[PDB]
Write a protein of this length. Structure first.
Lengths: 228, 201, 239, 213, 220, 250, 232, 199, 204
C-alpha cells in the first residue's frame, strides 16, 4: 500500500518502473533476431478497423543511416526519443565525422532514461530495441524505461513475448546465416498470430551490411507468405 | 579565386579554381572550393572557407534529419528561409558567406546564389570572383539554355581558362561536376597546366 | 493501493484521467466525414441550436489554409486554443519551409504539444480530440485524427462520437471505387451514414465539400435539399 | 590596449609519407633577438597515430592541446576506442568556428597514421578551415620553404622533372636541407630542431642543432 | 541660470534667477528653479532642468515616505546622503547643479551639490555660470551671525552682481527665507536688467493677407 | 472519493468539466442581466445588489462597465474578481487600438478575454473566474454583436443571454417574444420592464435598485446612454399603464 | 468540492468562499470604527481601548493619514492595517508624483484599492482581516467609502463596522435618511456608536478623525474630550 | 537608386517594378521580381538591403495571411499600414536596425484604393504620389508639369510612358525590363513587360 | 540634424478668451517636398490640442503612446484631462528615455476641461516643461521673431487679430527661406466652437 513511485518501497524497490514493464505488455509484440549476416525483426501492426492505414503506425524506425530501430509500448514517447537520437546521431556525425555507433546510442538515451524531471512529470514507459550495423557488424540491442542495457542475440517484447521467448531460444541459430533466419522468423510469427497472415497484419525489418537499406521494401512480405 | 555556376538543359554545371593563396605567394593549390553536401546536391565555397563549410554542414543537419522522418521532397524555399535568417543574425559580425546553392529540383534545373548580407536570388548564371568579370564576357555572349552537356564542359572551363590564364589568385585544378536527375556526376579534375595547351589550340 | 491518477502511471500500466478524458469526446459533439481521389466531404451537426441565438458564434469547424482544414469535437474552449495554436504553427510552416503545409509536420506539432499539455502538474491535459481534414498536394486526399495522449492516425473516413464502430461497419461498403466517383452520390452517402447518427433532422446538419485543392464551402439549405431529393429517390427506386 | 594575440616564433614543417608521417618543428621559442627557452618542442603527440604541432601564440597552444587531451579521454572512455583522424580534424574546426568571434591564434599541422595506417596533412588556420593534403609548411619561415619544397618534393619550377616517391630517409635530408636555408634568413628558426617521425611501429624523434642567433 | 545661498543667524535665505537661456537668446523668461524637498528644506535647481526637476521630486519622494512615516521634522543630512548616493551611482551622467539648505531642529545647514554628488558644509554656496560674482559678494561681505534684513540684502546684491557679470543670468531675482518659525518665498523681487525697447510700434491689420478655407466644430 | 479532492487543474473523471459545473453555480448566485435584439441600437439592464437608500450612488455605472467608446460590458458575478478583468480587456482593447489605430473588433476581442479566463481555468491550480460579463458594440463587418463570457473558455455569446439562474423564467419569455426586424428599441425596453416586473423576484421595478444602459449607434460618436433612473420612473408608470390596460379586457 | 483550490482565492460549495470566510468572521471581531460623511467633509470616529492602565495611547496611533488631504481609519484586526498603511504610503505617493497633482480622490480609491484588492484577494498564505473606511476631499465634494477583505468597495454617508455592525447599520438606516445637517449627522452617528460601547468613556477610549475640504486634520484625545461626548 | 511608380487613380493604383537586380557592370539576373503579393487588396513593395526587405516581406506576409483566416477578413489599409510601422518603430531603436525605402499600395472595399508611405525611419505619410531614388528630380519635373488625379488607368500608363523615356538622359544605367501591375476590386492583374533597346 | 530633417515649426499663441495653435503644412525630407497633407497637430480629448515638431516617427509614436495612456485614464473616469495633467504626462513619458529620448518639440495648447480658461505650455524633447502664459516665439530671421511679436501679440487678443498676427509671423519667418513654405494650418479653439483655418503660402 501507499506506493511512493520513484520514492522507494518499505521492502523495498521501485514500483512504477515495474509498471512500465507492464506497459510493454499492452504494446505490439516485436521479435528480434541477430545473425552473423544481418538482423531480422518482425512485429504485428494489429489493425483495429479497416479505416486504419497500414503504414500510418510502424514499430520499426530508422535512427541513423546504418542504425535501425524497433519501438515498444507507447508511440508518442517512442517517436520523441526516436527523433531525439536522430539529432544525436547528426551531431555525432559532425564533430567526429563518423556515424554514431549503435553502442553509444544506448547510453545517450540511458542518461535521460529516468530523469524524474519534466519528462522521463510522469516517466515514459517506452521500451526501445536498437538494431543496425556498427563497426562490429550487425547488432541487436534491447533497453527498457529503467535504462537496462544487455546485448541479446534474439529479443522479444510486447504481449506474446512471454510465449515468444519460450520457443525463441530453442530454435535460434547463432552461427547460421540469414538464409535460415528467413524461415526462422515466420515460425514464431505464425505461432503467436491467431489470424491469417497478410502484408497489412505484420511488418518485416531486415538490415544487412551488404544489402541495405533495407530496412525493408514494399511487397516483400507477401513473398515470404507464398514461400511457406 | 574564380567561381561560376549556371543552369542549362541538363542540371547545373559547377566549375571553380582550386588555387587558394595569400597575396602573390603560392601556398596551397589543392584547396577544393566545390563541396558536395549530398549525393543529389552540390555546395560551393567562397569568401570565408569555414563559414560556407559550417552553414552547409548546418544546412545538411536539418535536411538529413528532415529526410529521415520523411524522405519527402524538400523545396529550396526551405533552404532559403532557414539559412538566410540564421546568417542574417551574424550580419555585420565579420562572417562572409559567398556560396551558391546548387542541386536538382524535381520540376527542372535550378540555381541559387546566397550572400552573407542577405542577398539570395534564383537565376540562370552566377559568377563570383576576381577574374569572374572576364568570365561574363566569354560565357554570357555564347551562353544558351539549350547548350549540350558536352558543350557545357568546354564553355565553363574556357571561362576558367580565360580567368586562370593570367591572374594572381586564380589557378590550380578545375573541379567540374554535372548535375542530373539522379544527382551530380563526377566528370574530371584538370589542372590549369593542362588548360594551357588544350584551349589555346 | 489505488491512488487514482495524477501524472504517474497506475499499477495496471495504464492511466485514468486519460481514459476518463476520452468519454468527453463520446459525450461531445459528434462528427462524420469521407474522402475521395479528389473531392472530400465532412459533417458535424450536433449543434443543438434553436435558431433563436447567434449562428456564427456556435460555428466551430474552421480551416488553417484552403488545403488543410480543422475539424474537432467536444468542447470548443480548448479547441479554440487548438485553432490558434495550429494557426501559429501552420503560419510558421507557411513562413519556414514555404511549401504547402504537410500533414506529417503539423500533426506532430499538435501531438508534441498535446503530450506536454498532459504532462506537467502543471499544464492541464486535453479532454477533447480532433481530426484533420484536407488534401495532399496534387489532389491526393489526406485525413488524420488526434488522441488525448498526443498521437495521430489516418483513416479512410471520419467516424467518431456515438457508434464509432457501427458507422465504420457502414463505411465498409464505402470502400468501393464508386465513392467518390461523382460528388452527387458522395454527399448523398454522407447524409446516409449520418441518418443513423443522432437525430439527423436536416436543421443542424452542416456539411462542407472540398473539391481537389479548392477551398470548401458550407452547403446552404438549397443544394442540400436537392442532394436529399436524389437520396430519397434512390431509396424509393431501390425496391 | 592589451594585445591578446602575439607571435612567439617557431616554424612547423610536417611532410607525411605514404605509409608514414614526419613532423618537424624547431624548438626555439623567441620574440626578437632574445631567446625565451632554447628547448621548446612544438610537436605534441595526442596518440601514437597522431602528432600535431602548435605554432603562434603560446597561451592558445597549451590551451588547445590540453583541451584535446581532455577530449581524447572523453571519446576514449565512451566508445572504448581511439579517436579517428577525421574526428579530431572536424572537432577542431567546430571549436574554432564557435570561437570565430574571439578565436585562438595558432598555426597547426596534423600528421600521423590514419585509420588505414597512412599519412595525411591538414593545414589549420584560426578560422578552422582544413583539407587533406600530402605535405604542408607552416610558420614564419614557410616563405622560403614551399618554393624550395615544391622544387624538390613537388617537382615544380623545372623542366623534365620526374616525380619520385620520397623514401623515409629521403624526407629526412630534404627537411634538413630546407631548414638550413631557412635558418640563414629567418631569425625565429634555430637552436635545437625537433623532427618527429610517425611510423607504424611507433613515434620517433630527433634533435638537430642550428644557429643560436 | 544662477543659484546661490547663505546661512544667517536665524535661518537660511535662498535665491535664484528666473532667466533660463538656451543659446544666445533667452528661452524661458520667467521660471522658478527653487524646488520643494521638505517643509523645512528647499532646493534650488540649475544645470539640466528636466534632470534636476525629476531628481528633486524623487529625493522628496524618498523623504515624504521617510518623514510622514516617522512624524518628525526631516534633516538636511538625509537629503544630502540620498543626493550623494544617487549621483555617485550614475557617475556624473546626470548633470545636477543644486543648492541644498534648510533649518532643522539641529539648526541651519547648507551644502553645495555637484553633478558627481560631492557636497561640503559651507555657510555660503554659489552655483551656476554666474556664481563667480555671486561668490565674491558672499566671500568678502558675509560673516557669521548675519542679521535678517542684512542677509536678504546680501543675497539680492549677490544675485544682482552675479547677473551683471553673467550673460545668461537675468530676469527676476528670487528671495526665499527659510527659518524655524517663519518660512517665506518672495517672487518676483526686482529685475536688474531689461531688454532694449523698440524705436516704434508696428500694427498688422486685415487686407495684407487672405484666408484659404475655414472649418467650424461647435462644442457643448 | 475520487472527485472530492481539491484539484482545479486536471479535469474530473466521466468527461464532464469538474469546476465548470460549480462555476455556473456561482454565476446563478445573485446575478442579474438581460439582453434582446434591437435594430439601429442595443439595450441592457442592471440591478443594484443593495437597495439601501443611504448609498451615495457615486459609482455612477457599476454593474455596467464601459470598456471602450463604442463598446461596454455588464458584470454579473463577484465584483472583486471582475475588476481585474475590466482593466485587463480594457488594456487589451487599448493596445489593439494603439497598434492598428482602429477600433478592436468584438469577434477576437471577446475570444481574447475568454482565452485569458481560460488560462486561469486550465493550469497552475489557479482559481477560475466565477464572473460572467456581457459584451455589446458595433463593427464595420457584422454590425451589432452580442456576447457573454463563460469561465470554461467557451463563450456563452449569443443574440440573447440568461443571467442569472433566476432569469430562466425570462428565457421562455424571450423565445416566445423572439422577433426580427422591428425596432423601436422601446418595444424591447417595455418588454424588459415586463421581465423585471414578472420573471425577476423584485416586483414594481424599483428604480434605485436597478439600472438600464442602452447603446444607440451613431456615426461616428456611437453614444452610450446611461439613463439611469431618470425616465425609468416613467417607464414604471408606462408598464403599469399596460397592466392597467390589460385588466380592462376581462 | 472544494474545487476552487487557491491562487487567488479559496473555494465554497454553495456561496461566497470558505476558509477566508473564517477570517471575515474575525473582521467582525475587530476594532469597531464609525465613520461619517457630512456636508463638505468626512468624519471618522474610531474606538481604541488598551488592556491595562499601564499603556499610553500617545505611542500607538490607529489613525495614520496617507496624504495631507486624505486620512483613514481601520475596522478590523492588527498590523495587516499597518501593512497596507506603508503600502498605501508608497502606493498613493507614487500616483501623486506621476501626474504631480493629487487628482480627485475617486481615482485614488481606484488605484490605491486596486493593489489592496489583489493584496487581500490573492493568496497571502494566511488571510487578511483588515477592512478600511476610505475618505478624502475631491473637487469640493468629499467621499466616504468602505472596503473589506473581499474587495467590495462601498459608499456610505454614515457607516460602522466591528461592533454595532448589526445594530448601528440598522440604526443609521432608520434615524438617518438621505443627507442631513453636518453636525446633526455626527450626533446620531455617535449616539449609535455609544450604543454597544462601554459605560466608561474617556478621552483615551475613542478617537475622532475629520477630513476637511481644506485637508485632513488628525485630532488628539485632548481636543476630543474638550469638544463633546456627544461631540457636535 | 530605383523607384516604382506611385500613380494613384480613383479606382486603381498603378505600380511598375524594375526587374534588374544586377550590380556593378554585367547583368546577373534580368527576371528578378521585386513585387510581392500579400493579399488581393494589398500589395507589398520594398527596396533596400536584401535581407532587410526579404525579412519584412516574410513577416508582414504571413501575419496578414494569419489574420485573414482568423476573423475571415483582411486588415484595413489603415490598420495594415500601422502594423508594419510597429515593426518599423522597433527598427528605429534596435540592436540591429534595418533599412527600407519603398511604400505599400493597397485597396479597400468601402474606402476604395489608398496609398500610404513607408520609410526606414518608421515615418508614415499619405500622398497620391512620391519620388524615391536618383530619378527624384526627373520624376517631379514631368509629373508636377502634367498630372491628372482622375486620369484613367490606361492613360496613366500613357503618362508613365513619358517617365520611362526620361529614365535615361544623363544616366549611364540600363534597367531594360520593367514589370507593371494594376490594382482594382478584383486584385492584382499582370501587365505586359517593357524592354529598352540597348543599341 | 533630426529636427531639420523633416522640419516644421509649431507656434501656439493664446488670445483673450480663446487659444490658438498653428503648424506649417510642409512635410518632406531635407530640401525636397513630399506631401503637404501630413498632420502634425493632433486632437486630444475635446477643446484641447497639442503641437509636435520634429521627426515624423517621434510625432506619431509619442502621439500614439500619449493617446494610449490618455484613453486608459479616460476610460477609468469619463471626465476629460487637465492641461496640468497632460503636461506632466508628456514630461514623464519623455523622461522615461534618458540617453535615448525622442527628438521632437511638443507644445500643449488647449482649454481647461472644467472651464473656458485657456492655458498653453511647451515641453523640451528631454521632458522639461517650459511655462509661458500665452505667446511663444519662433522663426528664422531674428528681427522678425522677437521684434514684431512684441508689438504684434496683445495682452488680450481677438481671433481676428490673433489669426492675422501669426499670419504675417509665418509669412515672414517661413517663406523667407527657400526650402520653407507649402502652407501653414492654424487651429483656434474656444469654449463655444472649434475653428480651423489655413494660411496662404507660395508653393516654391
Amino acid at each position: 500500500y501507499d506506493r511512493g513511485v520513484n520514492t522507494f518501497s518499505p521492502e523495498g524497490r521501485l514500483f512504477q518502473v515495474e509498471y512500465a514493464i507492464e506497459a510493454i505488455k499492452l504494446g505490439s509484440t516485436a521479435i528480434g533476431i541477430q545473425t552473423s549476416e544481418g538482423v531480422c525483426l518482425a512485429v504485428e501492426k494489429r489493425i483495429t478497423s479497416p479505416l486504419m492505414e497500414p503504414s500510418s503506425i510502424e514499430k520499426i524506425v530508422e535512427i541513423d543511416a546504418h542504425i535501425g530501430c524497433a519501438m515498444s509500448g507507447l508511440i508518442a514517447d517512442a517517436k520523441t526519443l526516436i527523433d531525439k537520437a536522430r539529432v544525436e546521431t547528426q551531431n555525432h556525425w559532425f564533430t567526429y565525422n563518423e556515424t554514431m555507433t549503435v553502442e553509444s546510442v544506448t547510453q545517450a538515451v540511458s542518461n535521460l532514461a529516468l530523469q524524474f524531471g519534466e519528462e522521463d512529470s510522469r516517466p515514459f514507459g517506452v521500451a526501445l530495441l536498437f538494431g543496425g550495423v556498427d563497426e562490429k557488424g550487425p547488432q541487436l540491442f534491447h533497453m527498457d524505461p529503467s535504462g537496462t542495457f544487455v546485448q541479446c542475440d534474439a529479443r522479444a517484447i510486447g504481449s506474446a513475448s512471454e510465449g515468444a521467448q519460450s520457443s525463441l531460444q530453442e530454435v535460434y541459430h547463432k552461427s547460421m546465416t540469414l538464409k535460415e533466419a528467413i524461415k526462422s522468423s515466420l515460425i514464431i510469427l505464425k505461432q503467436v498470430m491467431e489470424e491469417k497472415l497478410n502484408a497489412t497484419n505484420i511488418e518485416l525489418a531486415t538490415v544487412q551490411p551488404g544489402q541495405n537499406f533495407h530496412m525493408f521494401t514494399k511487397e516483400e512480405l507477401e513473398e515470404v507468405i507464398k514461400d511457406i | 579565386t574564380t567561381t561560376l555556376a549556371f543552369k542549362f538543359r541538363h542540371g547545373v554545371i559547377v566549375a571553380a579554381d582550386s588555387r587558394a593563396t595569400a597575396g602573390a605567394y603560392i601556398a596551397s593549390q589543392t584547396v577544393k572550393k566545390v563541396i558536395e553536401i549530398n549525393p543529389y546536391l552540390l555546395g560551393t565555397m567562397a569568401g570565408g572557407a569555414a563559414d560556407c563549410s559550417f552553414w552547409e554542414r548546418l544546412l545538411a543537419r536539418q535536411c538529413r534529419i528532415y529526410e529521415l522522418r520523411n524522405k519527402e521532397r524538400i523545396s529550396v524555399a526551405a533552404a532559403s528561409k532557414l539559412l538566410a535568417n540564421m546568417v542574417y543574425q551574424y550580419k555585420g559580425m565579420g562572417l562572409s558567406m559567398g556560396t551558391m546553392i546548387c542541386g536538382w529540383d524535381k520540376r527542372g534545373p535550378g540555381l541559387y546564389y546566397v550572400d552573407s548580407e542577405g542577398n539570395r536570388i534564383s537565376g540562370a548564371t552566377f559568377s563570383v570572383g576576381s577574374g569572374s568579370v572576364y568570365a561574363y564576357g566569354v560565357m554570357d555572349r555564347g551562353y544558351s539554355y539549350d547548350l549540350e552537356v558536352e558543350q557545357a564542359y568546354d564553355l565553363a572551363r574556357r571561362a576558367i581558362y580565360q580567368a586562370t590564364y593570367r591572374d594572381a589568385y586564380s589557378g590550380g585544378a578545375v573541379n567540374l561536376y554535372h548535375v542530373r536527375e539522379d544527382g551530380w556526376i563526377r566528370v574530371s579534375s584538370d589542372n590549369v597546366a593542362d588548360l594551357h595547351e588544350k584551349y589555346s589550340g | 493501493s489505488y491512488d487514482r491518477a495524477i501524472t504517474v502511471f497506475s499499477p495496471d500500466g495504464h492511466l485514468f484521467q486519460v481514459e476518463y478524458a476520452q468519454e468527453a469526446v463520446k459525450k461531445g459533439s459528434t462528427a462524420v466525414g469521407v474522402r475521395g481521389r479528389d473531392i472530400v466531404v465532412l459533417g458535424v451537426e450536433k449543434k443543438s441550436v434553436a435558431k433563436l441565438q447567434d449562428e456564427r458564434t456556435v460555428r466551430k469547424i474552421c480551416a488553417l489554409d484552403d488545403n488543410v482544414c480543422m475539424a474537432f469535437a467536444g468542447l470548443t474552449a480548448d479547441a479554440r486554443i487548438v485553432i490558434n495554436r495550429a494557426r501559429v504553427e501552420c503560419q510558421s510552416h507557411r513562413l519556414t519551409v514555404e511549401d504547402p503545409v504537410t500533414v506529417e509536420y503539423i500533426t506532430r506539432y499538435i501531438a508534441s504539444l498535446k503530450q506536454r499539455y498532459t504532462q506537467s502538474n502543471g499544464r492541464r491535459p486535453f479532454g477533447i480530440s480532433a481530426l484533420i481534414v484536407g488534401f495532399d498536394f496534387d489532389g491526393t486526399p489526406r485525413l488524420y485524427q488526434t488522441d488525448p495522449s498526443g498521437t495521430y492516425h489516418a483513416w479512410k473516413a471520419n467516424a467518431i462520437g456515438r457508434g464509432a464502430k457501427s458507422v465504420r461497419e457502414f463505411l465498409e461498403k464505402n470502400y468501393t471505387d464508386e465513392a467518390i466517383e461523382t460528388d452527387d452520390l458522395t454527399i448523398k452517402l454522407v447524409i446516409k451514414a449520418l441518418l443513423e447518427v443522432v437525430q439527423s433532422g436536416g436543421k443542424n446538419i452542416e456539411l462542407a465539400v472540398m473539391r481537389r485543392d479548392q477551398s470548401l464551402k458550407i452547403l446552404n439549405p438549397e443544394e442540400i435539399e436537392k442532394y436529399v431529393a436524389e437520396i430519397e429517390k434512390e431509396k424509393e427506386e431501390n425496391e | 590596449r592589451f594585445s591578446p594575440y602575439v607571435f612567439n616564433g617557431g616554424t612547423i614543417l610536417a611532410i607525411a609519407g605514404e605509409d608514414f608521417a614526419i613532423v618537424a618543428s624547431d624548438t626555439r621559442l623567441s620574440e626578437g633577438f632574445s631567446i625565451h627557452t632554447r628547448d621548446s618542442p612544438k610537436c605534441y603527440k595526442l596518440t601514437d597515430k597522431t602528432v600535431i604541432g602548435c605554432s603562434g601564440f603560446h597561451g592558445d597552444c597549451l590551451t588547445l592541446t590540453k583541451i584535446i587531451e581532455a577530449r581524447l579521454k572523453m571519446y576514449k572512455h565512451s566508445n572504448n576506442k581511439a579517436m579517428t583522424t577525421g574526428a579530431i580534424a572536424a572537432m577542431l574546426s567546430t571549436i574554432l568556428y564557435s570561437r570565430r568571434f574571439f578565436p585562438y591564434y595558432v598555426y597547426n599541422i596534423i600528421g600521423g597514421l590514419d585509420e588505414e595506417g597512412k599519412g595525411a596533412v591538414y593545414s589549420f588556420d584560426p578560422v578552422g578551415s582544413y583539407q587533406r593534403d600530402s605535405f604542408k609548411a607552416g610558420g614564419s619561415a614557410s616563405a622560403m620553404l614551399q618554393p624550395l619544397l615544391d622544387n624538390q618534393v613537388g617537382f615544380k619550377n623545372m623542366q623534365n622533372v620526374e616525380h619520385v616517391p620520397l623514401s623515409l630517409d629521403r624526407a629526412m635530408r630534404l627537411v634538413k636541407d630546407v631548414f638550413i636555408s631557412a635558418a640563414e634568413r629567418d631569425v625565429y628558426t634555430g637552436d635545437a630542431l625537433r623532427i618527429c617521425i610517425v611510423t607504424k611501429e611507433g613515434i620517433r624523434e630527433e634533435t638537430v642543432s642550428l644557429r643560436k642567433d | 541660470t544662477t543659484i546661490a545661498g547663505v546661512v544667517y543667524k536665524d535661518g537660511i535665505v535662498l535665491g535664484a534667477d528666473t532667466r533660463a537661456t538656451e543659446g544666445m537668446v533667452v528661452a524661458d523668461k520667467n521660471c522658478s528653479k527653487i524646488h520643494f524637498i521638505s517643509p523645512n528644506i528647499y532646493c534650488c535647481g540649475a544645470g539640466t532642468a528636466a534632470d534636476t526637476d525629476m531628481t528633486t521630486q524623487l529625493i522628496s519622494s524618498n523623504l515624504e515616505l521617510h518623514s510622514l512615516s516617522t512624524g518628525r521634522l526631516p534633516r538636511v543630512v538625509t537629503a544630502n546622503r540620498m543626493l550623494k548616493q544617487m549621483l555617485f551611482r550614475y557617475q556624473g551622467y546626470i548633470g545636477a547643479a543644486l543648492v541644498l539648505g534648510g533649518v532643522d531642529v539641529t539648526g541651519p545647514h547648507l551644502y553645495s551639490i555637484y553633478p558627481h554628488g560631492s557636497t561640503d558644509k559651507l555657510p555660503y554656496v554659489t552655483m551656476g555660470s554666474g556664481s563667480l560674482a555671486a561668490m565674491a559678494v558672499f566671500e568678502d561681505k558675509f560673516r557669521p551671525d548675519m542679521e535678517e534684513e542684512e542677509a536678504k540684502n546680501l543675497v539680492s546684491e549677490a544675485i544682482a552682481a552675479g547677473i551683471f557679470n553673467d550673460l545668461g543670468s537675468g530676469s527676476n531675482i528670487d528671495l526665499c527665507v527659510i527659518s524655524k518659525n517663519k518660512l517665506d518665498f518672495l517672487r518676483p523681487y526686482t529685475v536688474p536688467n531689461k531688454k532694449g525697447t523698440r524705436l516704434g510700434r508696428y500694427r498688422c491689420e486685415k487686407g495684407t493677407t487672405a484666408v484659404l478655407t475655414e472649418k467650424i466644430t461647435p462644442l457643448e | 472519493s475520487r472527485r472530492y479532492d481539491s484539484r482545479t487543474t486536471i479535469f474530473s473523471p466521466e468527461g464532464r468539466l469538474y469546476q465548470v459545473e460549480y462555476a455556473m453555480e456561482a454565476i446563478g448566485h445573485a446575478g442579474t442581466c438581460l439582453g434582446i435584439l434591437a435594430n439601429d441600437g442595443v439595450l441592457l439592464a442592471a440591478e443594484r445588489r443593495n437597495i439601501h437608500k443611504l448609498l451615495d450612488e457615486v459609482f455612477f455605472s457599476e454593474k455596467i462597465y464601459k470598456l471602450n467608446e463604442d463598446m461596454a460590458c455588464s458584470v454579473a458575478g463577484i465584483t472583486s474578481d471582475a475588476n481585474v478583468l475590466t482593466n485587463e480587456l480594457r488594456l487589451i482593447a487599448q493596445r489593439y487600438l494603439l497598434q492598428y489605430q482602429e477600433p478592436i473588433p468584438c469577434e477576437q476581442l471577446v475570444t481574447a478575454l475568454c482565452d485569458i479566463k481560460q488560462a486561469y481555468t486550465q493550469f497552475g491550480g489557479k482559481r477560475p473566474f466565477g464572473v460572467s460579463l456581457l459584451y455589446i458594440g458595433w463593427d464595420k463587418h457584422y454590425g451589432f454583436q452580442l456576447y457573454q463570457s463563460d469561465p470554461s473558455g467557451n463563450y456563452g455569446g449569443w443574440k440573447a443571454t440568461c443571467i442569472g439562474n433566476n432569469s430562466a423564467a425570462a428565457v421562455s419569455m424571450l423565445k416566445q417574444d423572439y422577433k426580427e426586424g422591428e425596432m423601436t428599441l422601446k418595444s424591447a425596453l417595455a418588454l424588459a420592464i415586463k421581465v423585471l416586473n414578472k420573471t425577476m423576484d423584485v416586483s414594481k421595478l424599483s428604480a434605485e435598485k436597478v439600472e438600464i444602459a442602452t447603446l444607440t449607434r451613431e456615426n461616428g460618436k456611437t453614444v452610450i446612454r446611461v439613463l439611469k433612473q431618470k425616465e425609468v420612473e416613467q417607464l414604471i408608470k408606462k408598464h403599469e399603464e399596460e397592466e392597467a390596460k390589460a385588466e380592462r379586457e376581462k | 468540492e472544494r474545487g476552487y483550490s487557491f491562487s487567488l482565492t479559496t473555494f465554497s460549495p454553495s456561496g461566497k468562499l470558505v476558509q477566508i470566510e473564517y477570517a471575515l468572521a474575525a473582521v467582525a471581531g475587530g476594532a469597531p470604527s464609525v465613520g461619517i460623511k457630512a456636508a463638505n467633509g468626512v468624519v471618522l470616529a474610531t474606538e481604541k481601548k488598551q488592556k491595562s492602565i499601564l499603556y499610553d495611547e500617545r505611542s500607538v496611533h490607529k489613525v495614520e493619514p496617507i496624504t495631507k488631504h486624505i486620512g483613514l481609519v481601520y475596522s478590523g484586526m492588527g498590523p495587516d492595517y499597518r501593512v497596507l498603511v506603508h503600502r498605501a504610503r508608497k502606493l498613493a505617493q507614487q500616483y501623486y508624483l506621476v501626474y504631480q497633482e493629487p487628482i480627485p480622490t475617486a481615482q485614488l480609491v481606484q488605484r490605491v484599492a486596486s493593489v489592496m484588492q489583489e493584496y487581500t484577494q490573492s493568496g497571502g498564505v494566511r488571510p487578511f482581516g483588515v477592512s478600511l473606511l476610505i475618505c478624502g476631499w475631491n473637487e469640493g465634494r468629499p467621499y466616504l467609502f468602505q472596503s473589506d477583505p473581499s474587495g467590495a468597495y462601498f459608499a456610505w454617508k454614515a457607516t460602522a463596522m466591528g461592533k454595532n455592525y448589526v445594530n448601528g447599520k440598522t440604526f443609521l438606516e432608520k434615524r438617518y435618511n438621505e443627507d442631513l445637517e453636518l453636525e446633526d449627522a455626527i450626533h446620531t452617528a455617535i449616539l449609535t456608536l455609544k450604543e454597544s460601547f462601554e459605560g466608561q468613556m474617556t478621552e483615551d477610549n475613542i478617537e475622532v478623525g475629520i477630513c476637511n475640504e481644506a485637508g485632513f486634520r488628525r485630532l488628539t484625545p485632548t481636543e476630543v474630550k474638550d469638544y463633546l461626548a456627544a461631540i457636535a | 537608386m530605383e523607384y516604382l511608380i506611385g500613380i494613384q487613380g480613383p479606382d486603381y493604383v498603378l505600380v511598375a517594378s524594375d526587374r534588374v537586380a544586377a550590380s556593378n557592370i554585367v547583368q546577373m539576373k534580368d527576371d528578378h521580381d521585386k513585387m510581392f503579393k500579400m493579399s488581393e487588396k494589398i500589395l507589398l513593395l520594398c527596396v533596400g538591403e536584401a535581407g532587410d526587405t526579404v525579412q519584412f516581406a516574410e513577416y508582414i506576409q504571413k501575419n496578414v495571411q494569419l489574420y485573414k483566416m482568423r476573423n475571415g477578413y483582411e486588415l484595413s489599409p489603415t490598420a495594415a499600414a500601422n502594423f508594419t510601422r510597429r515593426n518599423l518603430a522597433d527598427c528605429l531603436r534596435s540592436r540591429t536596425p534595418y533599412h527600407v525605402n519603398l511604400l505599400l499600395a493597397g485597396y479597400d472595399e468601402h474606402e476604395g484604393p489608398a496609398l500610404y508611405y513607408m520609410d526606414y525611419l518608421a515615418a508614415l505619410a499619405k500622398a497620391p504620389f512620391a519620388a524615391h531614388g536618383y530619378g527624384a528630380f526627373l520624376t517631379l519635373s514631368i509629373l508636377d508639369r502634367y498630372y491628372t488625379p482622375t486620369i484613367s488607368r490606361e492613360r496613366a500608363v500613357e503618362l508613365l510612358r513619358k517617365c520611362l523615356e526620361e529614365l535615361q538622359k544623363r544616366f549611364i544605367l540600363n534597367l531594360p525590363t520593367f514589370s507593371v501591375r494594376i490594382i482594382d476590386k478584383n486584385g492584382i492583374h499582370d501587365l505586359d513587360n517593357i524592354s529598352f533597346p540597348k543599341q | 540634424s533630426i529636427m531639420s530633417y523633416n522640419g516644421g515649426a509649431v507656434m501656439a499663441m493664446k488670445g483673450k478668451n480663446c487659444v490658438a495653435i498653428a503648424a506649417d503644412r510642409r512635410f518632406g525630407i531635407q530640401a525636397q517636398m513630399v506631401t503637404t497633407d501630413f498632420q502634425k497637430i493632433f486632437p486630444m480629448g475635446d477643446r484641447l490640442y497639442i503641437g509636435l515638431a520634429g521627426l515624423a516617427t517621434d510625432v506619431q509614436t509619442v502621439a500614439q503612446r500619449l493617446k494610449f495612456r490618455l484613453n486608459l485614464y479616460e476610460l477609468k473616469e469619463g471626465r476629460q484631462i487637465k492641461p496640468y495633467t497632460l503636461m506632466s504626462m508628456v514630461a514623464n513619458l519623455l523622461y522615461e528615455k534618458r540617453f535615448g529620448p525622442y527628438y521632437t518639440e511638443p507644445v500643449i495648447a488647449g482649454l481647461d476641461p472644467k472651464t473656458f480658461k485657456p492655458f498653453i505650455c511647451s515641453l523640451d524633447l528631454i521632458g522639461c516643461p517650459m511655462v509661458t502664459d500665452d505667446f511663444v516665439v519662433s522663426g528664422t530671421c531674428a528681427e522678425q521673431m522677437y521684434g514684431m511679436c512684441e508689438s504684434l501679440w496683445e495682452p488680450n487678443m481677438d481671433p481676428d487679430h490673433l489669426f492675422e498676427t501669426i499670419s504675417q509671423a509665418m509669412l515672414n519667418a517661413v517663406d523667407r527661406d527657400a526650402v520653407s513654405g507649402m502652407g501653414v494650418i492654424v487651429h483656434i479653439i474656444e469654449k463655444d466652437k472649434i475653428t480651423t483655418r489655413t494660411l496662404k503660402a507660395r508653393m516654391d
